[PDB]
Design a protein around this ligand. Sequence first.
Ligand SMILES: [Zn+2]
Lengths: 78, 209, 108, 986
Amino acid sequence: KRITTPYMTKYERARVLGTRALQIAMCAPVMVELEGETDPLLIAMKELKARKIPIIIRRYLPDGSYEDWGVDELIISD
Amino acid sequence: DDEEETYRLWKIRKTIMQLCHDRGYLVTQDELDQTLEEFKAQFGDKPSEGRPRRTDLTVLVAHNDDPTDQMFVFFPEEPKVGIKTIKVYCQRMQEENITRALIVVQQGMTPSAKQSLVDMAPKYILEQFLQQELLINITEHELVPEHVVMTKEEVTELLARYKLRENQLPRIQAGDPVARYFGIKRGQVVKIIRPSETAGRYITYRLVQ
Amino acid sequence: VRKKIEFERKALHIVEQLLEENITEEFLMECGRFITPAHYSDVVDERSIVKLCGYPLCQKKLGIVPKQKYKISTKTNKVYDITERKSFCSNFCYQASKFFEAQIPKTP
Amino acid sequence: FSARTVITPDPNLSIDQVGVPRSIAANMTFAEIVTPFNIDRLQELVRRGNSQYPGAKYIIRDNGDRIDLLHLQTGYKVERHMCDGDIVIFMGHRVRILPWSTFRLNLSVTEMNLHLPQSLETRAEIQELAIVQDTLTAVRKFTKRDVFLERGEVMNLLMFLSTWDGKVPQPAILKPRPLWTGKQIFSLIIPGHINCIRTHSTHPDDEDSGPYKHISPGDTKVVVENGELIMGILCKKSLGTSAGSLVHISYLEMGHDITRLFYSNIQTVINNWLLIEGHTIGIGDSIADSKTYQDIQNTIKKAKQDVIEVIEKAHNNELEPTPGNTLRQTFENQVNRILNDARDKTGSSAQKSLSEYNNFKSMVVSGAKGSKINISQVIAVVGQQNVEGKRIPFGFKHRTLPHFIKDDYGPESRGFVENSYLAGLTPTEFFFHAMGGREGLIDTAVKTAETGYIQRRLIKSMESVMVKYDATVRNSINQVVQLRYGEDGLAGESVEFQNLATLKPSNKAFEKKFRFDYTNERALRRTLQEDLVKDVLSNAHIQNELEREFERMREDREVLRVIFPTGDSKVVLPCNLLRMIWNAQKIFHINPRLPSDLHPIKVVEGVKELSKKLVIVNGDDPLSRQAQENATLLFNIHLRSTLCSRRMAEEFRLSGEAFDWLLGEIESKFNQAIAHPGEMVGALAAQSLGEPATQMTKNVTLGVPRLKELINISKKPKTPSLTVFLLGQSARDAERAKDILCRLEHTTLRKVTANTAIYYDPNPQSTVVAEDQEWVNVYYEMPDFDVARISPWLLRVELDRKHMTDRKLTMEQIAEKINAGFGDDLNCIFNDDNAEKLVLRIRIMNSKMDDDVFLRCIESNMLTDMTLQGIEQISKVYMHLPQTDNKKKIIITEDGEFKALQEWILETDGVSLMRVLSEKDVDPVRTTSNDIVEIFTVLGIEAVRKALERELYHVISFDGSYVNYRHLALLCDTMTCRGHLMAITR
Ligand SMILES: [Zn+2]
């Protein structure tokens, strides 16, 4: 049983992009084909819309029960 | 003086019957909307010379689910209720084998009387109601939303569904006028339905503490 | 915590004990130390409710209540509120009662 | 850490961009770690060194050693001077380097420090989470029909469009010369396909009623279609952030990311056009023609003559004062009203004087927020100067200034400035205006501090309130404040103002507009294609389904009527259905003059599964279904009322593909509107409710003190009022309402007595008072009391006949009250009711210090303790008709219309609600009070929560400021969920 909104919140987006950018700035392997532009933030967002971010988000219910969500199935309105 | 007391007693009886109906007791519809003339004909139009003397005005009702509840509603003759007449009422409840009764007082009881009444709760459930508080139904006010008492199994399934604890749920004080109106004790939950301009109408839950 | 409930349990038991009937001086004296003045005032209230004086020593039933306050005395030339005097059958009982609450301990 | 510097505006910068001097930029550095695909540029920067600006300062190896300014490899954290594209915070802004030494920003939303974060995570999160009266006038001048731009001007303006597609539009005029229009240029500025309707400020109300209602004789109501300005002049309400403005609609439709581009394009294009058109202000803008000046002078002279006549009549003082006020207050109110209405009339005449060329009118018609009064003062009259809400006080002995006469209440004194600012103020007027300005400065100084304190207290109150992942609102200690945010679990920034369109119309109108009469077979052909018409007419299941769905919509309308009294159609709903229908019509080029191919049953079915697809509470568990129904009841009813078959086939006339697109758009927008979990809802609500406190600048407390006592749980309100309504015939006739009033207003012996005196009687038969002798002889014969027991002294009080008649009091009531209060030994005798000079006597029945001082003390403790009528808590009661509909009873007629009935209501200073509610013939449903503690002690926690939110809404909306109901509900539930009223943390 996995009940939660299928969208990804603005705060979740902020933290996942920050963490991914930090990882790829520490020379983590990239799963999307690269362009000539260099900025790690830009490659982070372009891999985000590429829908292959290798990070899942754990969503903590108020009682304390976690609820994992793969970023692949988190559809994005923007 | 005389007609004013008749109107006051009629209002008290009407509000008591409305309270009993809201509590789930078998209350006849015709007696709910009892007019001044009907009350005067049934009991008396002049409480002076003790024709209606707060006696025979006692309300006997039975719960729809359990006909054996037969909750009493008493109107003591004395303006201030004492411990001795409380014991008399308890003995009467025993000799009709009934554990729930309300008392309509005029100027209240002593705090010692309140403690004595509340101490012997498990054997018989007794509650005190002031003359002024029953002069009008608070639940009919526009500020007071709809309150309903929900069963223990309903509370358990509510907590299981929403995944909440008793403390996490908001609570309403046991001394709240609505809480005393519905006769709800600590640990119960009351469901509140209120009109809302953003969702039509909204449902919340309040614990009793 | 630290067994508080027994204190007011005993106090209330004393409350209905004084409401029963005539009380001897020794029992009242020994029970006055464990009850607050509010408890004795409440006892006076219920005892007045049952048409008794409010002073446990006397047991004669009080007469007709004057149902009026602010009694004026020209001999003393003073106004006294008698909302408490209506409880007591006689004035002497009223003075004795007040003298009794004058020295009731306030300890819990 | 940084260097602070004053901010200097720079329109050329982006709205999200900040101009930073190169010196300050090189002063502090941003740390970046070496990456395999950025080693070259970092190597170049480190080779440049610290001497030049675009270099680096320190290098940190993997071991943490710090090297000042050489090999760079993976893992090396080098701090380089900040450059273009960096993010800094003071909200995050993009950094641009500019020559001079001042920080630069655009002023479009409304000395300070700045900080740039070092780690990439915080930079990313601030990046992902973070037109002030200046361009409004030039936009208004630019959208005039008079604006025609030459080819070169059009090209110059076009180059400043960042979103320009590069295609030069064909000019509005081709011959004799190619002339464009400012409307075309702004149409190019408008992004996407925005459809908007917004009346202009100048647009009068008679245009719509009469002909030419959309050919716009006076360049009337603004219409924008397909993201381009079709017609109208863009004033503040049509351009500034508001409900359903161009900027607001564009944002809600397709993103703030390009709403910022819209702002930038507007600013740049408008500035460049105003470079050649030019704007100015000068003497000639305050020299309104001699006709209007003469009219203003004549009106001022008439007002002064009226004030002089009022003063001379007040000297003759026939002039029956108004009820509820003394002579001084009534006549001060009259003078103030005369002066204020004269000032307003002169200001209106001065504003209407400016026809087309006055530069002040350009700001007035657009920026009418607070500039109307300043312009009126500049041209027409400065106006009356007030101190502490009153005219200038007599600082000297009954004289405002030594240049006047004593007891001078004329307009010349007391602080009325006849002359405007252009004509110059007389020295007395100058001093009075100085006093008024000093009072205003004091008020602003205290108001800013109080508003700041209130904001801090409110943000501290609920800083920990957050929306959890289960779509529930909980605090830090994890108690559910609300099961769903805003009672519907949906965000507050994605909602719009709409109308139900089914709550207001009467039953006949409702059935005329919401029944889809299929027994016509002629209008159906006009509105529907032949196949659909035949299918509807022939099939009976179609008709049965239509009837059942309009019946459920009718019962939904009844549910709305129950939920929404007073007929307030203005509601807040997340999806703007009318705008979406308009967008669908424009996108698919829907022709309203041709029959539609959309089946009504298709409409009903699409609505049904659309409603089934709008879920707020998940799960098929029955109480979850009930919660979902509660959350989406209002939206489902609005959708059914709007997207009904008759409306969709009669006025909307959408097609099948258009209807499917509309359903998809509604579903997507509703899903996006749901409040995402984790939002700082408490802080947002606190700041939203605290921002109006800046502009929060029968006597009832209101404004800042009202909010202070509302957030507090103070037991002593400054002016605790208690509104009282009646049931029937009492609420209609004034006599019965007064009868109800007299038994509710407290009445001691002071309010009824006129004079009191103790006499000494050598014999009651002697009766030294001559007028009372015959009555005394009549009374003491056959006495009910003991004559020998009477005191020699006598206390004779003559009552006030008017006071007794007003309160419907009689002698026997007073006598029985005395008897109850004191007993039999206070023998009192009352003369008569209809007898002239009514009076009554008191003696003492015998039963130390002084005999007469004893009666003195008895009278002293009697005159203010008898409580003849009313409740001692109720200080006073005022009776009036509620002019506003908020306090006016509103019912539903037999035909279904909302009818407001004018009934007498009472406002009591002094609060005791339980007794008033228990009082006969007092409305037990609507009677309430502003004392929240009293409401909680009498009614309950839910009732006090509702009363508190009503009072907070009233105090917020008194001055016109609007706060979303979600924030107010969150604030009220935050401090009422404990089970009892709690004060703020402070
Ligand atoms: Zn006695």
